[PDB]
Amino acid sequence: VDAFLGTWKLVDSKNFDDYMKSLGVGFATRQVASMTKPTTIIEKNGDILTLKTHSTFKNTEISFKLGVEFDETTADDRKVKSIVTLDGGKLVHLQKWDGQETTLVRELIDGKLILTLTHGTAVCTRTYEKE
Ligand SMILES: CCCCCCCC/C=C\CCCCCCCC(=O)O
């Protein structure tokens, strides 16, 4: 886990709109979201991880232990059952609600943090660089 810790800022995004539309997010929120550049902060205290996502539009914060399910309310106001684990060096966050699922996978490549989000047929890639 140690290599993911720190402060990261978004520098590229591909197909976020398709991902948001798949989840049912409405047009007006997709407009603002397409022009937002979040800051993600990942920290650890023993076996507890804290992931903060900050922006001018919305802010989220979750705390969890790897491998242990938790309740989460997402930026889009879904109430989901989540679990985060380490799989081949990637941090894999799975969300489930009403029979559906989406995955948020984080990998380090060349010192950047790549976040891939998949729901349905839509796949979005977002690139973050370390601050
Ligand atoms: C908290 C910052 C979110 C910015 C706009 C999001 C508004 C809601 C729409 C879809 C939410 C999808 C779930 C979270 C995606 C987070 C993306 C990321 O961390 O870059």
Swiss-Prot record:
Listed GO MF terms: cytoskeletal protein binding; icosatetraenoic acid binding; long-chain fatty acid binding; long-chain fatty acid transmembrane transporter activity; oleic acid binding
Entry domain remark: Forms a beta-barrel structure that accommodates the hydrophobic ligand in its interior.
Residues holding octadecanoate: R126, T127, Y128
Gene3D superfamilies: 2.40.128.20
Name of the protein in question: Fatty acid-binding protein, heart
Residue(s) carrying N-acetylvaline: V1
Chain positions recorded as hexadecanoate binding sites: R126, T127, Y128
Native source organism of the sequence: Homo sapiens
PANTHER family the UniProt entry points to: FATTY ACID BINDING PROTEIN
Function of the protein: FABPs are thought to play a role in the intracellular transport of long-chain fatty acids and their acyl-CoA esters.
Residues bound to (9Z)-octadecenoate: R126, T127, Y128
Phosphoserine found at: S22, S82
Gene Ontology cellular component annotations, sorted alphabetically: cytosol; extracellular exosome; extracellular space; nucleus; sarcoplasm
Modified residues (Phosphotyrosine): Y19
Subcellular location: Cytoplasm
Highest taxon in the source lineage: Eukaryota
Keyword vocabulary terms for this entry: Acetylation, Cytoplasm, Lipid-binding, Phosphoprotein, Transport
Similarity field: Belongs to the calycin superfamily. Fatty-acid binding protein (FABP) family.
Entry-linked InterPro entries: Calycin, Fatty_acid-bd, ILBP, Lipocln_cytosolic_FA-bd_dom
GO process annotations (BP): brown fat cell differentiation; cholesterol homeostasis; fatty acid metabolic process; intracellular lipid transport; long-chain fatty acid transport; negative regulation of cell population proliferation; phospholipid homeostasis; positive regulation of long-chain fatty acid import into cell
Modified residues (Phosphothreonine): T7, T29
